[PDB]
Symmetry: C3
């Protein structure tokens, strides 16, 4: 074995949560070992129960967030069980060479492969399947995409010599979906991804998703699965979109520090209302919560947010600050003596 570094196995966790990691570290470079297992399966993607033929890393949309530090090596075992029907591979936008690794990781059902890439570039980055040709968009918009974060060894900073530390981290993977409809407008169902392909490709061609979802379905991060926080906590929100632009916004908040292009060698922007994730990238925002209550986290095409699935909630515990905002007068009848022209 030429590369003589310590090895550390990481157990991935399902989004929107993130596996255990250090922000700053004084450990030297390691070989960080990850396993991704491809799973093709039918999944429910909206609140009416619509299904579609998904293809996933590790059974989730998005695939899980991987976290390493600058100078680590990332050794990924990609597994394509024989219950799957298609070949698969993986392209890390964090990696250098061989189409991000895609040219070294094509595996048929029943095979696995081991790729190592050096984490030379800091930031959050997309990873996605990319078998070749028209299969590249198809596998990605069927769900085969996630992200990796390469932290500086000293953790995050503000680009002005001040360290930034998060209390909590969430990973929001946004997915554009292209579900075929019948002549009456009802979504169609299929028995396999291969059977769904031709009709799906026709929808894809017109560049208008039927659904835009976080964490794999409409409503995934609302209701009992709202994201928790507390007043005072500095929360890092990683957002990825492997195929299509997005414009994240935290309703009732801001982006205190935003890396919209997602790369920690660049100073963040401050005090944003809405930021922009270019399709094929990950970005990140830090926000320190100042008020309790419900926050909606959306793409601020509000049609997509409210009508195609792209809303998450935060539920924030703590005490209300009437200095920042207050209801001076509750709703009341318009005074008789008013003129409102």
């Amino acid at each position: 074995d030429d590369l003589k570094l310590p090895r550390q196995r990481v157990d991935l966790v399902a989004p929107p949560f993130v596996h255990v990691h250090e922000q700053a570290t004084k450990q030297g470079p390691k070989i960080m070992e990850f396993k991704l297992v491809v799973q093709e399966k039918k999944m429910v993607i909206d609140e009416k129960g619509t299904t579609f033929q998904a293809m996933t890393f590790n059974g989730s949309m998005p695939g899980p967030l991987m976290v390493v530090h600058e100078g680590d090596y990332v050794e990924v075992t990609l597994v394509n069980p024989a219950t799957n029907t298609m070949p698969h591979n993986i392209d890390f936008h964090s990696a250098t060479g061989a189409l991000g690794g895609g040219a070294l990781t094509l595996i048929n059902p029943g095979e696995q492969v081991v790729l190592r890439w050096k984490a030379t570039r800091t930031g959050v980055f997309v990873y996605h399947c990319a078998p070749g040709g028209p299969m590249i968009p198809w596998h990605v918009v069927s769900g085969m995409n996630g992200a990796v974060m390469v932290l500086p060894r000293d953790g995050l900073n503000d680009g002005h010599g001040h360290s930034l530390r998060y209390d909590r981290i969430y990973y929001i993977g946004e997915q554009d979906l292209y579900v075929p409809r019948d002549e009456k407008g009802n979504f169609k169902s299929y028995d396999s991804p291969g059977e769904a392909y031709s009709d799906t490709e026709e929808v894809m061609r017109k560049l208008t998703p039927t659904h835009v979802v976080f964490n794999g379905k409409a409503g995934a991060l609302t209701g009992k699965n709202a994201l928790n926080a507390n007043v005072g906590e500095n929360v890092l929100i990683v957002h990825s979109q492997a195929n299509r632009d997005s414009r994240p916004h935290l309703i009732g908040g801001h982006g205190d520090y935003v890396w919209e292009t997602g790369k920690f060698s660049n100073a963040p922007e401050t005090g944003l209302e809405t930021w922009f994730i270019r399709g094929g990238s990950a970005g990140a925002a830090l926000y320190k919560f100042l008020q309790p209550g419900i926050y909606a986290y959306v793409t601020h095409n509000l049609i997509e947010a409210a009508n195609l699935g792209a809303t998450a909630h935060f539920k924030v515990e703590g005490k209300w600050n009437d200095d920042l905002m207050t209801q001076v007068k509750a709703p009341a009848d318009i005074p008789t003596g008013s003129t409102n022209e």
Copy 2:
């Protein structure tokens, strides 16, 4: 009354103009009092006379620009006259908490509410109605959006320790509209917003506007309503888009200083050709005019600009500078001795 600051009432003016304000101020924080009255009404939105069922703040698309300074408090009386049919509210992207104020301002026809928010974040920001659910996009794309500018108390700067001062300010609100068509392709008319809803939502779902307009209609800021300027004037152009991306461009000019994400804690970019307003945001550009004549101000999807309504004009008075540009030879027949292969 706990908050013991001077109160100042502001009279709003219709876009693209902006109410009287100071750039730099040595006044301390104030409670700045604004009134917004919701008006649902049919409006003309294109040059062929197409109408649609609009919903507005203060009778205009966009709603008027509010201008305050960092550290002021903004006390907004939102009025929903009983002639309206729907509930309404307001979300300030400038504000912290309660979904931007939307969770504290839902009012039925016949009611008003008073919200106060502290202007802790500098920049230009969207405000918009957001009643809940699918009503959020519907109210916004029906016209219920505007912007607020929170200036630093020392006015604008270049991010490199130099003050910037504008001679003139204009507010360009861009609106994506989704007007239903009949089976022949003609735009449909309705007697109320409620009657228009179902057909409008179907158009919205396909994410392709029928119209993209400035100041509420195609041609609003062309012809006799071109925007005036003079050679030498430094003009601030605030641009908002509450739902959908835009790419502003001043044809024949530049953006000397551009805050495309719209937030004055970040240094502007210099010398832009075209900038980018992410849907759900406001941005701003300063330009010092150097040449007289007509300028077109567009979104630089030229299909949207020329064919869906999204062109404004500036008419600039002054003297032409032949050093910057000149017609060396006027159109003339191609010389007989020419070879043009």
Copy 3:
């Protein structure tokens, strides 16, 4: 003649290549002389042989890249041969006044015009035809757009006082096309641009291209026309899009230094995965190749890249660096003792 500077004639070359130029220069300002000849012609735009009625500068999509330095004057002879059917003009986003020159360059078939503009603004910029009204988008999406680069006289820098020098430069013009289809879905053919107009405008109105291509057609820069480079070379990739957004990505690489808004008075961003060209602009990225092999250069809407034409290749010669990336284990059967749940 009032302007007493040396004159230099430049011979343009077809994209993706760039005419001979100096990066840094100690020559003083010159009048740089360029000729552009409009050519309307049918062109093949995809791998199935689909044609469409194009309109070009100098016979190519994009038009050729012009390169000058800050403070030069650019004297452009625009020629509209009498074999063409339409009037044409030119708008330089690099220029100040008269709608970028469009208001001084409208020429009928059989005419030519000479425009001079001073290169006061550094960066890469779009130029495009803009006759007036609905003809503006039509001429642009028919192919009448290119770019000009205005280099600082000291050449490029990193925004932190370090010079940057490229070994190679390529110009990637991306074109959104709107080809009519018949009732069966087959692309229609026409005998002239005028005959194609009405059906084309209907496609344009729905804001969804049928094709998104580099260098004028699907596959233009793949196969025998892949872009060459070598390990170690710093390559400047200029990307323009005159009408519609794009999100460039170099698969297997990065953007070491990226001016996504395209203007050299602003420091570049570092280490990008994917960048963003706002419609109506040019941007530029520098990358130093570190690995040999094939790279795909795409817009990272992968549907557009793989299915609508928007993929180029680089073929990079040199030696593989197993430190940066290696295939630890080639594809092999999943071990019997594995558990992959």
